[PDB]
Design a protein around this ligand. Structure first.
Ligand SMILES: O=c1cc(-c2ccc(O)c(O)c2)oc2cc(O)cc(O)c12
Ligand SMILES: [K+]
Length: 115
């Protein structure tokens, strides 16, 4: 069925809000977060980050219909942002972007509180 339940629509809107957010200069903050690079490409990432997470993984779980609720999806986003903030330095752009996107995530959830 092409029709999403309300819970599915909400999950999609949250996801899409983070994905599509662009700053005043037209930059899409989510670009770097979509797909994690490999073990070779990011030294020490997978030894040091306990639960790797990227937006493609989140998107797949959503498409397979495995978030039972909004908080579960939020959890995964927060894990991703924390991972990025653990691995990268505060001065790095990825770290700054993770902070903005975290605010985008919570604002969006909060805005959709009564759907
Ligand atoms: O730390 C992360 C770092 C990167 C990353 C992606 C592309 C690059 O050219 C780069 O120099 C770093 O991508 C991520 C993507 C994520 O979803 C989560 C992360 O923690 C990272
Ligand atoms: K750090």
């Amino acid at each position: 069925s092409k029709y999403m339940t309300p819970m599915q629509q909400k999950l999609n809107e949250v996801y899409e809000a983070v994905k599509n957010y662009t700053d005043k200069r037209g930059r899409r903050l989510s670009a770097i977060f979509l797909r994690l690079p490999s073990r070779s490409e990011l030294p020490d990432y997978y030894l040091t980050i306990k639960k790797p997470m990227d937006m493609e993984k989140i998107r797949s779980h959503m498409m397979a219909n495995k978030y039972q609720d909004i908080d579960s999806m939020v959890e995964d986003f927060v894990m991703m942002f924390n991972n990025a903030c653990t691995y990268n330095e505060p001065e790095s752009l990825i770290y700054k972007d993770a902070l903005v996107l975290h605010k985008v995530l919570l604002e969006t959830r909060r805005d959709l509180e009564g759907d």
